[PDB]
């Protein structure tokens, strides 16, 4: 798809508004509309916006930013009226002088893809995204009231969101997605939708799309879709399971029928590199305070650093599917993260495993939550950052994460997350009053 | 049907989503949707799911499970829209490598069918599960409020669920059910729908279907369908009378016009066999704590172990119908049980009766509830397990049930029921506060 | 005062009930009443109780505990009726075989006092206890609603605890306290009563007596006295400043009339030891999760390890008073701490500072909250443990704190605090739903 095909699709399908979109450094999608009559000149001039009103983008005395449109991302939004049909287009962020903005999260992922190509590979991540369907209130703003008390794979009337989950599938299919499965998840009113994997760029655009498509579809039905990692205590949390495989010559490099476990050496080294660096960018994968209330044992979320086949208690699970389905599933990432930065760091953590032949230890093919602390330390197992501050500390000292993100993204990400933590740590919570007020 | 017929029916009838379904060990239906485009892939590769999130199924270190589809069990759900028509397919659970997971209740029932064939028989059970129709609250959750005060065979306006029952029959007919009759039952808001008998596999699939079809239609019509055996006190409860029969060369083996009572010797031995073993697997037919509030005298629910013709106070009634309709009605089970396990155990017990020529005693052709304890003890009549713990104890000590179920199903059924009961024996109920708390 | 004097006072002042009391490991006062008629024999037989129902005392297999009475602690409670006058007696916890149970906080403080005696010193401590006065709801339960909006030294009607503080001072004077000054504190509805210092044992007893006297007096007037460090956010917290000096031959050892700053060398060494060991037992001085929400900058609660004269932003302030009155004010602790453990650890740290001439650096006669991180790092200033887990970690690796507390107190304190933190670390607070749940 070129700029000329987008204009033809705008005329043929009667598009009136194009929503130019980009993602800010914290993974939030920023969008604004232009008339179709402007598209042409936009394509040769770029749209202009204010970078000082975007998180971690640019300062107020140098605030003008340009957005250059990517014609390949032209999609048509199906939940908006077909008369004045509304399309969307994602773009890259440029400085007004003309150079690409190094602070663009979508540029970091492109830079990582460059190194992947230099080594002759291409990441083919495809994520599992889970969300919660809560009820709205009179005004129409989010709540945490459950829409049902169902469980895993539960049928109606325990599962009350199947009519609201057909339309998500339909919208995704109209937006170029390839749905694979759709089901209720372990937590009450928690659902998960899986779509086919693809290139890292397309998959990250799909992640941000999927998120806002799901939220918009839920809103127009009376509910609210929340991709918050741990909205409820004592039940499962939402994860963003990142299954990834390297592809060379259009073949799965991670597959090897001759070796035991049908896992090639490049997959072993990729795992080794992924484990050597996960501690450093857990801040990126789990970027909010809530994402660390999900990393507690007993809810199928990782707490320690390990890897084993078929083990949904471990960090790097290897599903049983071999052949063109041989991938590694990283289970830490949360749907609240920035997919561009997260995928970039995953990509070049594996590429540090291949260039340095980083052998991981023996797999821990056992439940790790049912181990003593002595058992865990004797086996060499280490734990993930306990809270967001510990992850921030592990991230600041990193040279790998700074080299991957770059100075601007590194510094601005850290500055936002430190402010978040400083706001969090001073707060007095109702738990503290209900625990200490009467006893002291 | 076959694979190709399913695809032809998906194209011809315009099916968009296929709901792949199975049954967990405790009898709950677990389903999830895949696009029709995925169907051809799911027939050659199976659909993978998490076994660790299914009750009594598999552990979290080897949690991957495959599910292979059964083309014959392909139906089209009528209460879902006809534009994006939704079908369902039941499957058999497999270990991810190649094996037919033995913890699957469907596999247990198939194993019992194998022994039936080895003896040259085929069970033809047809059940008559009852249910209650309660009202939903403002949110739409189940309540125990009555939808009518009617009784047995009551007409309107005492019977207020004629439209609900008519639409349930309509949907069941579209799902391939041969409806026999439909009526109000003794308890208020309690209804019963009867469909033709068939092969035990088909009728177990039909039991699970019937249940979720009824529940979904009731939900969409405003009410809640409850298969709880004893939802209300003082009124009779819901049971799943299993009318069992053996067929050889397409002829009812239990029929014998020359013998008195028109019951063959094989029927006699089957009665003796499943009378000697019921105490052992009452924890399967009656699997929940509420299941034994139903087994109290005075409500046409069995309390003792006996058989007699047309006696609705006895454990094994023999209806008056002879000829092709000659069967034996085991009245103990609830609709809360797992039909795959329950029918398997009944079939195995009957076949064990036939092998060892187990003659039952004389038929107790009296109201057993009216007999005294001395009368029952002198007549040799035994009682069923009084509560869930007694049934668990009678079941774990048995070798017949362990052989029939297998180690995995046996142990994971015990464990589940023991944890269920241990959570119930420690509860302080408002009955104890209404009785005590003022006298003490 | 001895047993004979206690009996004489019981007869003379018409006492019927004696509240035998002791402090548990976590600082909570546990008491029970015995009739005066039993006193005469309790003195020679102790009073037996159940140690398994006391936090960190003993196990259920060996739960029988004895408590011996201390006649010197006999006080008469003035807020209870004078007809059947009620007295109190603090006890020492023994073991039924007969030995000074080492898990007793009183025993730990007594061991620290013995350690001091060998060096010729006697520790004098004057606590600085602040509290909040909140309203009680309809049922008489604690709330967090303010009883006034006054500030520091505010007069009525801005200060609305005139009568409450007047009667608290009266009760404390009746219980042998020498009241120094009562005033309104910085936070709204925060109050401070100061009493004269004394021997560390006597003032450790006074600390628990003060808290329960204040709580009872406030309760009888319709309020709730809260000794919670940080019950409200954005407002000063309650701290228990430990003013401490060393006396040798009835003279203040910390005073030196001919020396700059008029502080003796022993005072300098005591400061050095306190500073060098503070990080290790911050889990004792600040033992609850809420005590580290008080240790935030901008509220006159210390955040960093420093010392300077008249600096209320410093960890160790040295007030301007000299002569009899020269002390060091450790501002770290909060009222929620166990005074017996806290004073014991401070005394041991100071004595360890004196034994090895631990010179502290130059004082930081500067506001430290206003310094940058770079400035603090350049000056070598270390920060206090950021949260309860950090303090727990710093305490576990300590050999000094284990030496002072002992194996039993050490281990049981660690266990209680780790359980507390693990309960707190997994909670989802409303702050997380107000911040996220719309952003995500
Ligand atoms: N070779 C591959 N490389 C990367 N991702 C893949 C590959 N094969 C499958 N996937 C993706 O893995 C995801 C697995 O999702 P799903 O099977 O629903 O959950 P789980 O695998 O945790 O049971 C799918 O979204 C799919 O697109
Ligand atoms: N030969 C047979 N074998 C097994 N089941 C049968 C046979 N004949 C009839 N049935 C079943 O017995 C059930 C009888 O139900 P119904 O007559 O409504 O209640 P009841 O028999 O208790 O009065 C029907 O569902 C029918 O399918
Ligand atoms: N020599 C001393 N040793 C120990 N404590 C002392 C000494 N002199 C006074 N104190 C105590 O110091 C405390 C000072 O309280 P306060 O007047 O509020 O001081 P500040 O306002 O500086 O905190 C009093 O409780 C008093 O008993
Ligand atoms: C059953 S679950 O196993 C739930 C995982 C949980 N929500 C989490 O990873 O945080 N994971 P998956 O969808 O990969 O099967
Ligand atoms: C009158 S009843 O006859 C008794 C049903 C009752 N609810 C029971 O628990 O078995 N059932 P049916 O007529 O189907 O034999
Ligand atoms: C005005 S205050 O300065 C109170 C400080 C605060 N309550 C705290 O130490 O946490 N200090 P002090 O009581 O010693 O005079
Ligand atoms: Mg999934
Ligand atoms: Mg999932
Ligand atoms: Mg997964
Ligand atoms: Mg019937
Ligand atoms: Mg019936
Ligand atoms: Mg019947
Ligand atoms: Mg003061
Ligand atoms: Mg003060
Ligand atoms: Mg002070």
Author numbering:
A (entry chain D), B (entry chain E), C (entry chain J): 8 to 447
Task: List sentences from the manuscript.
The enzyme, glutamine synthetase (GS; EC 6.3.1.2, L-glutamate: ammonia ligase) plays a central role in cellular nitrogen assimilation by incorporating ammonium into glutamine, which serves as a carbon and nitrogen donor for the biosynthesis of nucleotides, amino acids and lipids. Here we describe a structural dissection of the archaeal Methanosarcina mazei (Mm) GS and its regulation. Like the Gram-positive GS, the Mm GS active sites are formed at the interface between two subunits in the hexamer and are comprised of five regions; the E flap (Mm residues 303–310), the Y loop (residues 369–377), the N loop (residues 235–247), the Y179 loop (residues 152–161) and the D50 ´ loop (residues 56-71), which is the only active site region contributed from the adjacent subunit. Like other GS dodecamers, the Mm GS dodecamer is formed by two interfaces; hexamer and inter-hexamer interfaces.
To address this question, we reacted Mm GS with the GS inhibitor L-methionine-S-sulfoximine (MSO) and ATP and obtained a 2.7 Å cryo-EM structure. Notably, the proximity of the region composed of residues 167-168, which form a distinct interface in the apo Mm GS structure compared to the low G + C GS, did not impact Mm TS formation; the Mm GS TS adopts the same active site and loop structure for residues 167-168 as the bacterial GS TS. Like other GS, Mm GS undergoes large conformational changes compared to its apo form upon Met-Sox-P formation. In the Mm GS TS structure, the ADP is anchored into the active site pocket, next to the Met-Sox-P. The ADP adenine ring is contacted by GS residues Ser252, Phe204, Gly332 and Arg334, while the ADP β-phosphate is hydrogen bonded to Arg319 and Arg324. The Met-Sox-P is contacted by GS residues His248, Arg319, Arg324 and Arg338. Because Arg319 and Arg324 interact with both ADP and the Met-Sox-P, they help orient the molecules in the active site. At the other end of the pocket, the side chain of Mm GS residue Arg301 contacts both oxygens of the Met-Sox-P carboxyl moiety and the sulfoxime atoms are bound by Mm GS residues Glu137, Glu192 and Glu199. GS catalytic residues Glu307 and Asp57 cover the active site, which positions the Glu307 side chain for proton abstraction of the ammonium. Although the Mm GS TS structure and interactions are similar to other GS, to further test the Mm GS TS structural model we mutated Mm GS residues Asp57, Phe204, Glu307 and Arg319, which the structure indicates are key for Met-Sox-P formation, to alanines and performed enzyme assays.
